[PDB]
Amino acid sequence: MGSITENTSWNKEFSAEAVNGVFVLCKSSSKSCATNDLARASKEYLPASTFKIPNAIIGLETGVIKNEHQVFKWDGKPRAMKQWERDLTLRGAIQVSATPVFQQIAREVGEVRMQKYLKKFSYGNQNISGGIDKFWLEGQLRISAVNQVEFLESLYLNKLSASKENQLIVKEALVTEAAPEYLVHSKTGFSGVGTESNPGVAWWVGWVEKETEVYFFAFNMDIDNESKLPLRKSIPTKIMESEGIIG
Amino acid sequence: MGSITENTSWNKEFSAEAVNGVFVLCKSSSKSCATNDLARASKEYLPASTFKIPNAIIGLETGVIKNEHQVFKWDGKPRAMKQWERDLTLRGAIQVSATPVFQQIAREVGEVRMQKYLKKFSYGNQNISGGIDKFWLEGQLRISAVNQVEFLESLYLNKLSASKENQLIVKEALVTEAAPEYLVHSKTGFSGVGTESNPGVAWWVGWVEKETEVYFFAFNMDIDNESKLPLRKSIPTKIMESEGII
């Protein structure tokens, strides 16, 4: 990105909900970003399920995921969420956030190739220690809101070190809202509730293609109670609504 | 397509609105399709703006459309709808149905290349006579609901005679509804009102990717009054709702 500035016009959206968090919103045409909290925008957190973005691309690029029509069959063995207990397409697995599918993908990719792609993608601190199938969930991997938007811009432009085909496949799988004037591509994440003193993190990252403009965004917040989870989308949605981008 | 079978259970969605039309619905593949009207399923009509699908693919394949991020700049000269009087992306031009953008694409593609691609795509009667920039609007080109679903299935499978990249670009541009369990890719069309004796045609074609299944669809209807236009979506939507698809 070309620039970043701190603003205060979004602060009310956080204070109204007693949330400690950050929103970063970048306009493609001007390469300029705005945030409510410059310091927090550079702080690095567990990606949790936002990692499904690079993991999907790496899965495709290595051939672990055959193509965009791959179905990930459920083996009948119980999963942590009922919604995960079914056959899933790539978009399906991303949209219900079926972590076990992606844990199997990561295992097949393996440490050497995973390390290589995270370096190529400049993905956070690029630290995959903690187990090949959990580094992004409970391990050492950390990424900032600024880094999320940088990464997403590269994906949008097909500038990642992967085939254009594979970037396109992932981009379509990430579509979460379609309107005649805009398309939203996005992914949520949630590390857990942590403790009161050491809270978890929740994310919502993505981009909005709106007329001929493109807006890259990354939201994160501290979370110590699962009841607060919907705020990860409502706060940034309200901000982007008040900016006239969506809604 | 393998076989097409009559399903009389959707008739009420048509009769309730006094509409003469056809819906063609195919689960998984065009091996077996269902319809309310065997004869009309294969009757060929002007594609109107449903032609924006092959035209976009051909524009990309020929390099007339440079890439996925091409902006079609408005020259500031009057266009037939105010919503077309602005710079547009490829998805934008498709979604608002900006005919003049696609007319210019067609002119640049040219007759020889256009004919070649419609033959490759098996697109309707492949008749491009009536002027390079209006054959799908008022010319001799005709396509049926069955042929639309065949063509859309090929696109979905990346099996058209075009790069996989170009087919993926057009597929994303066609996304019109996103839900956690389903994605709808679709395009409307409307030839005009014609006359009570010789009505125009309205279309809605596309596919729904639901759970691990895919459903290809094509709807058309006779239309002589623009008031009836929303029926081109509401009738097939009601049918697909009652099938449990959307």
Side-chain angles (χ1 to χ4, degrees), chain B residues 1-6 24-27 29-35 38 41-42 146 149-150:
Chain B
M1 184 188 56
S3 82
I4 188 159
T5 69
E6 179 191 68
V24 173
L25 181 65
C26 318
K27 183 172 198 255
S29 77
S30 64
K31 168 164 78 168
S32 196
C33 299
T35 187
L38 298 183
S42 292
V146 165
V149 297
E150 293 170 337

Short mmCIF file of all heavy atoms in Angstrom, two decimals, chain B residues 1-6 24-27 29-35 38 41-42 146 149-150:
data_model
loop_
_atom_site.label_atom_id
_atom_site.label_comp_id
_atom_site.label_asym_id
_atom_site.label_seq_id
_atom_site.Cartn_x
_atom_site.Cartn_y
_atom_site.Cartn_z
N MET B 1 -27.48 -32.80 -24.79
CA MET B 1 -28.41 -33.22 -23.70
C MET B 1 -28.87 -34.66 -23.96
O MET B 1 -29.06 -35.05 -25.11
CB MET B 1 -29.60 -32.26 -23.63
CG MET B 1 -30.57 -32.54 -22.48
SD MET B 1 -32.03 -31.53 -22.63
CE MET B 1 -32.49 -32.05 -24.29
N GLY B 2 -29.02 -35.44 -22.89
CA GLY B 2 -29.50 -36.83 -23.01
C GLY B 2 -30.98 -36.88 -23.37
O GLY B 2 -31.35 -36.94 -24.55
N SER B 3 -31.83 -36.88 -22.35
CA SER B 3 -33.27 -36.82 -22.57
C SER B 3 -33.86 -35.61 -21.85
O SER B 3 -33.24 -35.09 -20.91
CB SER B 3 -33.93 -38.12 -22.09
OG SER B 3 -34.16 -38.07 -20.69
N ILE B 4 -34.98 -35.12 -22.34
CA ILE B 4 -35.71 -34.11 -21.62
C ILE B 4 -37.11 -34.61 -21.32
O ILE B 4 -37.81 -35.14 -22.20
CB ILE B 4 -35.71 -32.74 -22.32
CG1 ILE B 4 -36.32 -31.67 -21.41
CG2 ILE B 4 -36.40 -32.82 -23.66
CD1 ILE B 4 -35.91 -30.23 -21.76
N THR B 5 -37.49 -34.47 -20.05
CA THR B 5 -38.75 -35.00 -19.53
C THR B 5 -39.68 -33.90 -19.07
O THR B 5 -39.25 -32.86 -18.56
CB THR B 5 -38.53 -35.95 -18.32
OG1 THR B 5 -38.06 -35.19 -17.19
CG2 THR B 5 -37.52 -37.04 -18.66
N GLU B 6 -40.98 -34.14 -19.23
CA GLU B 6 -41.99 -33.17 -18.85
C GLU B 6 -42.30 -33.32 -17.36
O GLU B 6 -42.40 -34.45 -16.84
CB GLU B 6 -43.23 -33.36 -19.71
CG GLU B 6 -44.39 -32.46 -19.42
CD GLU B 6 -45.64 -32.94 -20.15
OE1 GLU B 6 -46.18 -34.02 -19.79
OE2 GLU B 6 -46.05 -32.24 -21.09
N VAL B 24 -36.35 -24.90 -18.07
CA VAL B 24 -35.57 -26.11 -18.24
C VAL B 24 -34.60 -26.17 -17.07
O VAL B 24 -33.86 -25.21 -16.80
CB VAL B 24 -34.79 -26.11 -19.60
CG1 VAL B 24 -33.83 -27.32 -19.68
CG2 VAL B 24 -35.77 -26.11 -20.79
N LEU B 25 -34.62 -27.31 -16.37
CA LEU B 25 -33.80 -27.49 -15.17
C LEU B 25 -33.07 -28.83 -15.24
O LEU B 25 -33.70 -29.86 -15.48
CB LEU B 25 -34.69 -27.42 -13.91
CG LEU B 25 -34.01 -27.55 -12.52
CD1 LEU B 25 -33.05 -26.37 -12.25
CD2 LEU B 25 -35.12 -27.57 -11.44
N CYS B 26 -31.75 -28.81 -15.02
CA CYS B 26 -30.94 -30.03 -15.13
C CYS B 26 -30.09 -30.23 -13.89
O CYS B 26 -29.23 -29.41 -13.60
CB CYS B 26 -30.02 -30.01 -16.36
SG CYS B 26 -30.80 -29.35 -17.87
N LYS B 27 -30.37 -31.29 -13.13
CA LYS B 27 -29.52 -31.63 -11.98
C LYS B 27 -28.27 -32.37 -12.42
O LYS B 27 -28.36 -33.37 -13.16
CB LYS B 27 -30.30 -32.54 -11.02
CG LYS B 27 -29.53 -32.89 -9.75
CD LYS B 27 -30.46 -33.63 -8.78
CE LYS B 27 -29.90 -33.60 -7.38
NZ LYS B 27 -29.34 -34.91 -7.04
N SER B 29 -25.99 -32.56 -14.57
CA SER B 29 -25.53 -32.50 -15.96
C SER B 29 -26.73 -32.41 -16.88
O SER B 29 -27.87 -32.63 -16.46
CB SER B 29 -24.73 -33.76 -16.33
OG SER B 29 -25.60 -34.86 -16.57
N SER B 30 -26.47 -32.11 -18.15
CA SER B 30 -27.52 -32.16 -19.18
C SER B 30 -27.89 -33.59 -19.65
O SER B 30 -28.70 -33.73 -20.56
CB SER B 30 -27.13 -31.31 -20.38
OG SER B 30 -25.97 -31.85 -21.00
N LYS B 31 -27.32 -34.63 -19.04
CA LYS B 31 -27.78 -36.02 -19.29
C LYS B 31 -29.30 -36.14 -19.19
O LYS B 31 -29.95 -36.76 -20.03
CB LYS B 31 -27.10 -37.02 -18.32
CG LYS B 31 -27.73 -38.44 -18.32
CD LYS B 31 -26.83 -39.51 -17.66
CE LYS B 31 -26.85 -39.46 -16.12
NZ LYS B 31 -26.21 -40.66 -15.48
N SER B 32 -29.88 -35.56 -18.14
CA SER B 32 -31.32 -35.60 -17.97
C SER B 32 -31.84 -34.23 -17.49
O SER B 32 -31.46 -33.75 -16.42
CB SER B 32 -31.70 -36.70 -16.98
OG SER B 32 -33.09 -37.00 -17.07
N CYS B 33 -32.70 -33.61 -18.29
CA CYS B 33 -33.29 -32.33 -17.92
C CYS B 33 -34.80 -32.46 -17.77
O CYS B 33 -35.41 -33.37 -18.34
CB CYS B 33 -32.95 -31.26 -18.97
SG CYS B 33 -31.15 -30.94 -19.15
N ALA B 34 -35.38 -31.57 -16.98
CA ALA B 34 -36.83 -31.51 -16.80
C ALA B 34 -37.34 -30.18 -17.33
O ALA B 34 -36.63 -29.16 -17.29
CB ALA B 34 -37.19 -31.65 -15.33
N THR B 35 -38.59 -30.18 -17.79
CA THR B 35 -39.21 -28.96 -18.31
C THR B 35 -40.74 -29.02 -18.16
O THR B 35 -41.31 -30.10 -18.12
CB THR B 35 -38.83 -28.73 -19.81
OG1 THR B 35 -39.32 -27.45 -20.25
CG2 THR B 35 -39.43 -29.82 -20.73
N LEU B 38 -42.14 -29.67 -23.44
CA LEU B 38 -41.15 -30.34 -24.28
C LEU B 38 -40.87 -29.55 -25.55
O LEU B 38 -39.72 -29.34 -25.91
CB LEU B 38 -41.57 -31.78 -24.67
CG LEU B 38 -41.76 -32.79 -23.53
CD1 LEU B 38 -42.10 -34.14 -24.17
CD2 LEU B 38 -40.49 -32.91 -22.69
N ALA B 41 -39.12 -26.06 -24.90
CA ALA B 41 -37.75 -26.24 -24.38
C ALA B 41 -36.71 -26.13 -25.51
O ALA B 41 -35.61 -25.60 -25.30
CB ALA B 41 -37.63 -27.61 -23.68
N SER B 42 -37.06 -26.64 -26.70
CA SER B 42 -36.14 -26.65 -27.86
C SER B 42 -36.45 -25.57 -28.92
O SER B 42 -35.76 -25.50 -29.94
CB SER B 42 -36.08 -28.04 -28.50
OG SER B 42 -35.44 -28.98 -27.63
N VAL B 146 -32.84 -25.37 -24.01
CA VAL B 146 -31.97 -26.55 -23.94
C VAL B 146 -30.52 -26.19 -24.33
O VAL B 146 -29.57 -26.56 -23.65
CB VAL B 146 -32.54 -27.66 -24.87
CG1 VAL B 146 -31.47 -28.78 -25.14
CG2 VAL B 146 -33.86 -28.19 -24.26
N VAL B 149 -28.68 -24.27 -21.57
CA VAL B 149 -28.17 -25.10 -20.46
C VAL B 149 -26.95 -25.92 -20.89
O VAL B 149 -26.02 -26.08 -20.10
CB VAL B 149 -29.24 -25.98 -19.74
CG1 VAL B 149 -30.31 -25.09 -19.07
CG2 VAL B 149 -29.89 -26.93 -20.68
N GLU B 150 -26.93 -26.41 -22.14
CA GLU B 150 -25.76 -27.13 -22.65
C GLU B 150 -24.52 -26.23 -22.63
O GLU B 150 -23.43 -26.65 -22.18
CB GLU B 150 -25.99 -27.68 -24.05
CG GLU B 150 -27.06 -28.79 -24.08
CD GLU B 150 -27.47 -29.16 -25.49
OE1 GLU B 150 -27.29 -28.33 -26.41
OE2 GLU B 150 -27.99 -30.27 -25.67
#
